[PDB]
Write a protein that binds this ligand. Structure first.
Ligand SMILES: CC(C)CCC[C@@H](C)[C@H]1CC[C@H]2[C@@H]3CC=C4C[C@@H](OC(=O)CCC(=O)O)CC[C@]4(C)[C@H]3CC[C@]12C
Ligand SMILES: CC(C)CCC[C@@H](C)[C@H]1CC[C@H]2[C@@H]3CC=C4C[C@@H](OC(=O)CCC(=O)O)CC[C@]4(C)[C@H]3CC[C@]12C
Ligand SMILES: CC(C)CCC[C@@H](C)[C@H]1CC[C@H]2[C@@H]3CC=C4C[C@@H](OC(=O)CCC(=O)O)CC[C@]4(C)[C@H]3CC[C@]12C
Ligand SMILES: CC(C)CCC[C@@H](C)[C@H]1CC[C@H]2[C@@H]3CC=C4C[C@@H](OC(=O)CCC(=O)O)CC[C@]4(C)[C@H]3CC[C@]12C
Ligand SMILES: CC(C)CCC[C@@H](C)[C@H]1CC[C@H]2[C@@H]3CC=C4C[C@@H](OC(=O)CCC(=O)O)CC[C@]4(C)[C@H]3CC[C@]12C
Ligand SMILES: CC(C)CCC[C@@H](C)[C@H]1CC[C@H]2[C@@H]3CC=C4C[C@@H](OC(=O)CCC(=O)O)CC[C@]4(C)[C@H]3CC[C@]12C
Ligand SMILES: CC(C)CCC[C@@H](C)[C@H]1CC[C@H]2[C@@H]3CC=C4C[C@@H](OC(=O)CCC(=O)O)CC[C@]4(C)[C@H]3CC[C@]12C
Ligand SMILES: CC(C)CCC[C@@H](C)[C@H]1CC[C@H]2[C@@H]3CC=C4C[C@@H](OC(=O)CCC(=O)O)CC[C@]4(C)[C@H]3CC[C@]12C
Ligand SMILES: CC(C)CCC[C@@H](C)[C@H]1CC[C@H]2[C@@H]3CC=C4C[C@@H](OC(=O)CCC(=O)O)CC[C@]4(C)[C@H]3CC[C@]12C
Ligand SMILES: CC(C)CCC[C@@H](C)[C@H]1CC[C@H]2[C@@H]3CC=C4C[C@@H](OC(=O)CCC(=O)O)CC[C@]4(C)[C@H]3CC[C@]12C
Lengths: 135, 138, 138
């Protein structure tokens, strides 16, 4: 059983396996975003929208962890060296936009439609961000 | 079998791969504009396969000179007959349509022109030589 | 007779051959789409020469920015007044239209751009020298 566990641990820590797992999760998240923007939403979010919100929140926590686990000591230098990549800047802008849209959506009308609109502009961004996977 | 048509045919077959990569990038941009337009203009929809059709329908014919000009920004919320009320954020649909049409028709088609043009000579020489090779098989 | 218009005219005459080969491949793809569209959308037809006209009519103008958007996929078998029952396989026509428009407008026109650009220099030098030779005949 020990060689089987060694094979499992060696497979799941490979960078190609991690990349394909990230790619499949991103494609599934994008598909769920498509379902929650095409179909109507009620007063409370559905299960698919809760999965999309969880994806956004955990991605934001992961980007914060990438900010904290960097090379400089002083925090402004870590923020500056993380914002030197344009994709990190657009990721931060999109996560803040999703937060604003979800806050507006969790209220009543007419703010729910505003959150829906912000969701549509964000799905434009994530569809463009598929080129990171294509890279 | 013809000395000019044959290498032309396999040259078309060689540029099919560059056309395929172009189709992949156009599929990404087209699907973004279709999803955004359908999701803004139609908020209250049941789960139906017509939504998937409406993702692809109008943005695809927008590449070939049909912008569907009556549906860019139709007058709404106005007595003219009081036209139906405007949906929220419907002004973003012509803006993202402008960005989509610009990116598609001006960037990706011209980029496919450029990659067809700069790889033409090697493909033409290899296609002529491979046709002269396949004369034996014929 | 003009030093710039004359070489331009015989340069056009040189590119007519590449235009002819493009016309042949366009004719194959155009007739395939026209025959398929006419034979699917019109099942019960008598022998008439209008069928041959309908093969070439709308697919040819589809190359020049007129996609006939009212006839791509009209609502059928539905109250608009109930529309005529949808012909069997009528959904195949927009798909093969998509494939035809992609192949024609994006592949073959850009390929003709590629064959016009990479044979331009030899044709231009030959046309200039031939015009300078034919000055004596003029
Ligand atoms: C690994 C990658 C390449 C693919 C992973 C994504 C799919 C497995 C997911 C993404 C979108 C999902 C769909 C999104 C929405 C719905 C509607 C859902 O129906 C309802 O919510 C209403 C009825 C009910 O409550 O069951 C049933 C599941 C389904 C088809 C999901 C099935 C599973 C899908 C296709
Ligand atoms: C990790 C993410 C980014 C993608 C992984 C794909 C699947 C693990 C997910 C995607 C869509 C999900 C489905 C979306 C919608 C539903 C309907 C849902 O129906 C109800 O909850 C009905 C009862 C109720 O209303 O509470 C049951 C779970 C299910 C099938 C989900 C099961 C898990 C699915 C297939
Ligand atoms: C009405 C609609 C559906 C029009 C049909 C579109 C496609 C089904 C056709 C149009 C042009 C065809 C291509 C024209 C030229 C060639 C080259 C030829 O292949 C070779 O000569 C082999 C060597 C080589 O590929 O270079 C046959 C396949 C291919 C790619 C053809 C595959 C089928 C294509 C894409
Ligand atoms: C990125 C580019 C190069 C390719 C992406 C575009 C295609 C994948 C899309 C564009 C037009 C679409 C078609 C538009 C309309 C229809 C009709 C539809 O059938 C019906 O709606 C039934 C009949 C009816 O209800 O009127 C089936 C899908 C289909 C063929 C679509 C299939 C997908 C197509 C070919
Ligand atoms: C990265 C790219 C390739 C993502 C592409 C995503 C969309 C094109 C797909 C993914 C999930 C699909 C949805 C999954 C489930 C459904 C439910 C489905 O509902 C039914 O068929 C009715 C159910 C019944 O009554 O039996 C209608 C299509 C729809 C909305 C699908 C529409 C097309 C979606 C949004
Ligand atoms: C990846 C590149 C190189 C090729 C392009 C592949 C896809 C973009 C195509 C191929 C098959 C297509 C699907 C074939 C059939 C349908 C059913 C169709 O359903 C209807 O139109 C339902 C009828 C109606 O409600 O009117 C909706 C589009 C869809 C999902 C098509 C969406 C576009 C797809 C996924
Ligand atoms: C009103 C409609 C029907 C438009 C008419 C279209 C054709 C009847 C014309 C348009 C451009 C003409 C061409 C323009 C230039 C030339 C070059 C010229 O030929 C030469 O100078 C001889 C040297 C050489 O061919 O290189 C005259 C024939 C040709 C092919 C012409 C043939 C007749 C064409 C195809
Ligand atoms: C592959 C490309 C480069 C060339 C292929 C296209 C032509 C060969 C086609 C496209 C338009 C066709 C024309 C479209 C309409 C007509 C009118 C038609 O006359 C009538 O229908 C009589 C008057 C009437 O009944 O209204 C005679 C054929 C003709 C000239 C067609 C002849 C063949 C044409 C020129
Ligand atoms: C490889 C490519 C170029 C082949 C193209 C073939 C078709 C475009 C042609 C060849 C056979 C033709 C058909 C041959 C016979 C007839 C019968 C003809 O009937 C009449 O004229 C009526 C008889 C009468 O009352 O006198 C009408 C045209 C039609 C359908 C023709 C329409 C055009 C067709 C299908
Ligand atoms: C090979 C390339 C380089 C040149 C293109 C040649 C053909 C594609 C053209 C030239 C003569 C054309 C034909 C000339 C006259 C007619 C009669 C025309 O008859 C009608 O329109 C009948 C009236 C009606 O009912 O509308 C139908 C098209 C047709 C067969 C044309 C079909 C297309 C043809 C064969």
């Amino acid at each position: 059983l020990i060689p089987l566990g060694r094979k499992i641990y060696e497979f799941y820590n490979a960078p190609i396996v991690k990349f394909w797992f990230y790619t499949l999760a991103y494609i599934g998240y994008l598909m769920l975003f498509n379902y929650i923007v095409l179909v109507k939403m009620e007063r409370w979010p559905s299960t698919q929208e809760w999965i999309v919100i969880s994806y956004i929140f955990t991605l934001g926590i992961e980007k914060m962890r990438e900010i904290l686990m960097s090379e400089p000591g002083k925090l402004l230098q870590k923020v500056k060296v993380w914002l030197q990549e344009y994709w990190n800047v657009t990721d931060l802008i999109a996560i803040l936009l999703f937060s604003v849209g979800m806050i507006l959506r969790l209220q009543d009308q007419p703010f729910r439609s505003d959150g829906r609109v912000i969701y549509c502009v964000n799905i434009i961004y994530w569809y463009i961000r598929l080129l990171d996977i294509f890279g | 079998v013809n000395k000019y048509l044959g290498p032309y045919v396999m040259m078309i077959g060689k540029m099919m791969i560059d056309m395929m990569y172009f189709v992949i990038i156009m599929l990404v941009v087209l699907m973004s504009f279709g999803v955004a337009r359908q999701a803004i203009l139609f908020p209250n929809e049941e789960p139906s396969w017509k939504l998937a059709k409406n993702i692809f329908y109008m943005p695809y014919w927008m590449i070939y000179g049909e912008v569907f000009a009556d549906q860019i920004d139709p007058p709404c919320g106005q007595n003219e007959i009081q036209l139906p009320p405007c949906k929220t954020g419907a002004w973003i649909v012509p803006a993202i349509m402008a960005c989509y049409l610009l990116v598609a028709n001006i960037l990706l088609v011209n980029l496919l022109i450029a990659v067809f043009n700069n790889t033409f000579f090697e493909v033409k020489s290899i296609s002529n030589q491979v046709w002269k090779f396949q004369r034996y098989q014929l």
